[PDB]
Amino acid sequence: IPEGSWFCVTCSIKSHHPPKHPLSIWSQLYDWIDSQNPSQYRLPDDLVHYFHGISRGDTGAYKETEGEITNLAYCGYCSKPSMGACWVYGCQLCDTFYHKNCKEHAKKCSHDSIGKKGMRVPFPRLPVSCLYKVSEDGLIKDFLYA
Amino acid sequence: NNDYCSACHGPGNFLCCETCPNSFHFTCIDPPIEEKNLPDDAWYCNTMVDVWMQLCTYIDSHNPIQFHLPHSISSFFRGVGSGVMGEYIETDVLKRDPLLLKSKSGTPILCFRCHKSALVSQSILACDYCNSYWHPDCLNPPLATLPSNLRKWKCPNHSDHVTPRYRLPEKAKVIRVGLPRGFKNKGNIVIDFKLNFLEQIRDNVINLRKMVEQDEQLCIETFSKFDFYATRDCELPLRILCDVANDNLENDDYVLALRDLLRISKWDPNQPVPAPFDLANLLS
Amino acid sequence: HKISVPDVLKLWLVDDWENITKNQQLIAIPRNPTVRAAIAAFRESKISHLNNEIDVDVFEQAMAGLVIYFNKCLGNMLLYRFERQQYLEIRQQYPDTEMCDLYGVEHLIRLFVSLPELIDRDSQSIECLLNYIEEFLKYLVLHKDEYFIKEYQNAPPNYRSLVGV
Amino acid sequence: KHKISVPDVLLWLVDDWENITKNQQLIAIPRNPTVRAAIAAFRESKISHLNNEIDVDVFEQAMAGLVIYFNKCLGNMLLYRFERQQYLEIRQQYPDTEMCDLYGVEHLIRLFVSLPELIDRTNMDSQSIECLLNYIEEFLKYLVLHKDEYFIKEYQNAPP
Ligand SMILES: [Zn+2]
Ligand SMILES: [Zn+2]
Ligand SMILES: [Zn+2]
Numbered sequence: 001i002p003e004g005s006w007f008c009v010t011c012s013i014k015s016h017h018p019p020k021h022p023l024s025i026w027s028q029l030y031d032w033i034d035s036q037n038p039s040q041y042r043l044p045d046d047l048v049h050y051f052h053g054i055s056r057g058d059t060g061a062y063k064e065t066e067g068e069i070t071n072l073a074y075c076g077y078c079s080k081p082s083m084g085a086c087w088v089y090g091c092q093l094c095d096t097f098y099h100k101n102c103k104e105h106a107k108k109c110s111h112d113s114i115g116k117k118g119m120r121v122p123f124p125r126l127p128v129s130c131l132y133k134v135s136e137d138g139l140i141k142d143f144l145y146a
Numbered sequence: 147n148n149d150y151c152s153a154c155h156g157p158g159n160f161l162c163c164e165t166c167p168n169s170f171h172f173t174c175i176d177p178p179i180e181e182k183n184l185p186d187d188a189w190y191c192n193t194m195v196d197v198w199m200q201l202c203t204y205i206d207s208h209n210p211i212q213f214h215l216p217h218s219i220s221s222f223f224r225g226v227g228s229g230v231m232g233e234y235i236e237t238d239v240l241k242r243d244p245l246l247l248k249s250k251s252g253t254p255i256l257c258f259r260c261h262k263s264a265l266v267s268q269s270i271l272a273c274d275y276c277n278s279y280w281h282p283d284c285l286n287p288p289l290a291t292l293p294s295n296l297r298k299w300k301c302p303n304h305s306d307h308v309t310p311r312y313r314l315p316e317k318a319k320v321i322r323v324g325l326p327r328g329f330k331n332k333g334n335i336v337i338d339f340k341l342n343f344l345e346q347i348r349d350n351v352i353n354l355r356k357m358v359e360q361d362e363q364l365c366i367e368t369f370s371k372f373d374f375y376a377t378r379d380c381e382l383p384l385r386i387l388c389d390v391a392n393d394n395l396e397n398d399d400y401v402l403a404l405r406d407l408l409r410i411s412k413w414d415p416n417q418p419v420p421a422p423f424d425l426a427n428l429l430s
Numbered sequence: 431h432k433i434s435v436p437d438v439l440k441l442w443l444v445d446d447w448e449n450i451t452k453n454q455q456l457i458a459i460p461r462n463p464t465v466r467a468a469i470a471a472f473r474e475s476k477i478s479h480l481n482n483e484i485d486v487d488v489f490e491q492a493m494a495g496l497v498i499y500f501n502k503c504l505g506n507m508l509l510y511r512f513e514r515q516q517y518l519e520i521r522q523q524y525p526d527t528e529m530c531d532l533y534g535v536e537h538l539i540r541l542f543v544s545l546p547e548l549i550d551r552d553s554q555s556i557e558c559l560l561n562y563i564e565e566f567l568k569y570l571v572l573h574k575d576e577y578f579i580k581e582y583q584n585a586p587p588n589y590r591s592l593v594g595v
Numbered sequence: 596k597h598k599i600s601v602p603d604v605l606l607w608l609v610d611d612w613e614n615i616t617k618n619q620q621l622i623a624i625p626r627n628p629t630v631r632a633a634i635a636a637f638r639e640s641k642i643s644h645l646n647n648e649i650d651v652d653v654f655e656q657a658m659a660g661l662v663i664y665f666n667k668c669l670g671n672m673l674l675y676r677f678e679r680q681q682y683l684e685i686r687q688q689y690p691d692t693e694m695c696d697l698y699g700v701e702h703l704i705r706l707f708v709s710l711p712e713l714i715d716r717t718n719m720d721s722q723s724i725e726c727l728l729n730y731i732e733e734f735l736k737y738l739v740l741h742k743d744e745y746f747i748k749e750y751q752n753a754p755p
Contacts, residue, residue: 023338025653025727026660027324028717030667038671040679041705043612044712047601051609061616062609071603124571126437128312132335132720133322139337142327145648154511158594171514171594177505178518193553195491201551202499210506213540215447216547219440226444231511233451234444313441321720326656328649329722 009037023135052081073097073122077105091117154212155231166191168209176210223313242295244269246279258301259284273301309333393422431546433560436571439539442578446536451510454590455582459520461534468535468577469497472569492562497530500541504529508540512585515593535570535577542567596724599711600732604739605704607746615675620750622678624685626699628745630665633700634658637737657730662695665703669694673702680755700738700745707731 007014013035021027048056052072053065067073067080075081075088076096082088088097089106092115098105100119108117150156152168159181160169165188172181175189190209214220214232225238245264246255255270256263258278264270271280271292278301282289285302293299300306312334320336323329389397407425419425449455463471473493480486509517520532542563549556570577601608614620638658645651674682689697710731714724738745 023322023324024326024656024660025324025723026657026664028322028719029660029664029713032713032717033664033667033671040676041673041709043608044709047608047708048612054609062613062618123436123568124438124574126315126441128332128334129315130318130334131314131320132329132331133320133338134329134335135323135326135338138326138329141648151511156511156594171511173514173518173593174511178514178521180518194555195488195495195559198555198559199495199499201548202495202502205502205506205548212511213508213544215443216543219435219443219543220447222440223444233510234448235452313444315437319718321718323720323723325653325720325723325726327652329720 053083075099075102076107077102087119087121089117090120090122091115097122153210161187163187163189222316224316239298240296242292246270255279257281257284271299274298275300275304431549431556433546433563435543436568438571439567449582450512454585456516456585457536457579458583459516459532461532463577464532464534465500465530465538466497469493472566488558492559500538501528501530503541504533504537508537512593515589536579539570597711599728601708602736602739608708614750615677621681621753623751624698626697628699629696630698630700630703631662631696633745634662637734640737653726657727665706666693666695668706669702673705699747701747704735704738707735
């Protein structure tokens with residue numbers, strides 16, 4: 001722990017310009033990383049809103065909200081995902097699941113073998129929009145190759 | 147009146163107006179007639195789609211005007227501006243003395259190709275996109291005159307003469323391409339004491355003796371060949387003539403002239419070629 | 431008020447501007463797809479979402495009003511001076527034809543573009559108008575071989591002298 | 596630029612979310628295999644197939660940058676904040692080993708899933724982002740091809 005007036009990484013780059021990196025694929029990524037801050041992991045909001053019911057919370061976790069689209073955990077009673085427990089009534093030939101509380105809707109596909117059915121787990125745009133900076137050496141190696 | 151068309155601001159034969167004094171090219175006017183109106187003219191003196199089509203029908207009584215562009219579409223690309231009568235000009239090619247000897251930055255003014263000044267051939271040219279000077283006699287098309295002193299000139303040593311046309315959105319930025327090979331584009335790229343004076347004098351002396359020995363050995367080997375240079379290079383035309391007059395088809399440079407003759411008379415591949423002497427009656 | 435234009439259309443507009451006001455070239459006015467086919471071709475493609483009836487009526491009103499209106503501005507304010515002469519000749523070769531039957535969508539996008547200006551004289555209708563203006567713009571740019579020309583014509587030698595050249 | 600294709604098995608990521616946070620658990624993070632031992636696998640997997648010099652040079656640059664990039668990000672923005680005190684626990688055990696060689700490839704795929712939202716903070720050109728996202732999605736596919744020995748099979752219900 002240093003005493004006095006502590007400063008974060010943004011308060012660090014607030015006073016002294018850090019050195020930059022050469023030109024490779026990750027240069028700008030490195031700079032962005034060094035610049036901003038530390039903070040926890042946040043899944044993409046495209047991912048948490050994928051399964052029905054579940055959603056983030058205020059500094060929160062997998063929230064198994066009660067189940068009430070074309071590829072989530074479809075149920076044969078009310079078309080609801082399996083809240084809190086992905087175990088449902090299925091067989092080796094079943095197609096749609098049925099909750100353990102919805103076992104009144106246990107189904108059976110049109111199959112030949114009688115399998116074990118139970119609690120289981122399953123626009124044109126501009127052709128020139130900007131100027132590009134290049135490096136002389138990649139250009140030179142490109143030319144020599146061609 | 148005013149002596150400019152009230153639509154396009156142009157000079158010419160005006161249909162003027164008596165009451166509301168303006169001028170129209172009479173085809174820049176209202177529905178073009180053709181011409182020829184000598185008596186008084188008086189050119190136009192006088193919440194749903196319902197009211198907006200009433201706007202449509204109200205546009206009638208307001209004396210036509212030319213079309214230009216909105217401020218957002220003409221002022222969008224780089225180096226594009228309107229004229230004074232609303233035509234398209236390039237504002238990046240705007241703004242001569244033949245004999246220049248020293249620039250105002252106090253440097254010599256020597257051609258980029260032959261290295262000599264504006265005294266061997268009477269005139270020199272200065273590039274506006276570089277720091278290079280050229281003799282109009284050295285460019286390869288040779289300039290017979292000189293450009294105007296109001297448009298900029300561009301020396302032969304740029305790539306703008308081969309990149310086709312692209313126009314830039316005038317607020318684009320420069321994207322730093324970090325991709326260390328195989329980047330595709332079409333030409334829109336920017337690019338990213340000993341204090342020895344005695345040694346210098348000795349350097350120069352020994353270099354000069356090197357050069358002297360070099361040419362002293364060149365002339366030794368050249369000057370002993372004069373006797374065969376003269377013989378062959380001066381009896382050549384008579385050897386060519388002795389080959390042609392004897393009709394040597396083995397002189398592979400004779401039959402190439404014979405093929406030039408077949409290629410001048412535009413021979414048709416159907417007839418047989420003539421004997422090599424009889425094709426020579428193309429010449430006379 | 432302001433509408434948004436596909437940057438491809440800005441590039442094309444400025445190319446036409448330079449091509450006629452500086453390079454002395456012309457659009458070959460008799461248009462294979464005209465301004466009247468290019469509104470029916472939009473109605474018959476947009477009618478698939480005409481669910482509510484008030485919207486159907488407003489869409490119909492707008493399309494009819496705007497074709498008859500483009501007919502009332504092709505002589506006033508949709509031409510550069512170098513395009514007035516070619517006007518007369520066609521007005522003399524087709525005497526009593528509607529203009530939104532000869533000219534094309536090259537001259538019609540000039541009317542869509544120039545309408546935050548002409549709209550200054552405002553409850554709902556302007557918004558529903560500009561909405562179809564934008565959708566028409568991006569419906570035209572998608573069909574660049576249905577509503578646009580493949581070359582500008584070279585203005586004839588006798589033509590230049592009659593306008594001021 | 597905006598999109599990846601997470602193949603519909605990594606059903607794992609969100610599960611990873613639950614245990615650490617709700618069904619309180621942990622990953623003890625001395626790990627074998629480590630990140631560095633899998634990149635250097637997929638590299639050797641694919642680099643035997645690239646034809647020209649351009650392809651092998653860009654692949655090599657991306658992979659080296661990726662080991663170094665996982666190094667510099669793994670600390671500040673790649674942990675669920677319950678594997679944070681335990682991160683301090685492990686930071687005292689090994690002081691002389693870089694972070695790119697103590698974690699299996701289960702945090703790396705968190706990087707893989709959150710990369711595009713990070714390339715939407717920089718002004719890269721279309722070909723940089725295109726090849727980058729292509730390579731990392733190919734890596735995700737290769738990982739689901741071999742998840743036997745790469746991903747963990749249990750969780751460490753640990754004290755605070
Ligand atoms: Zn006029
Ligand atoms: Zn010269
Ligand atoms: Zn120059």
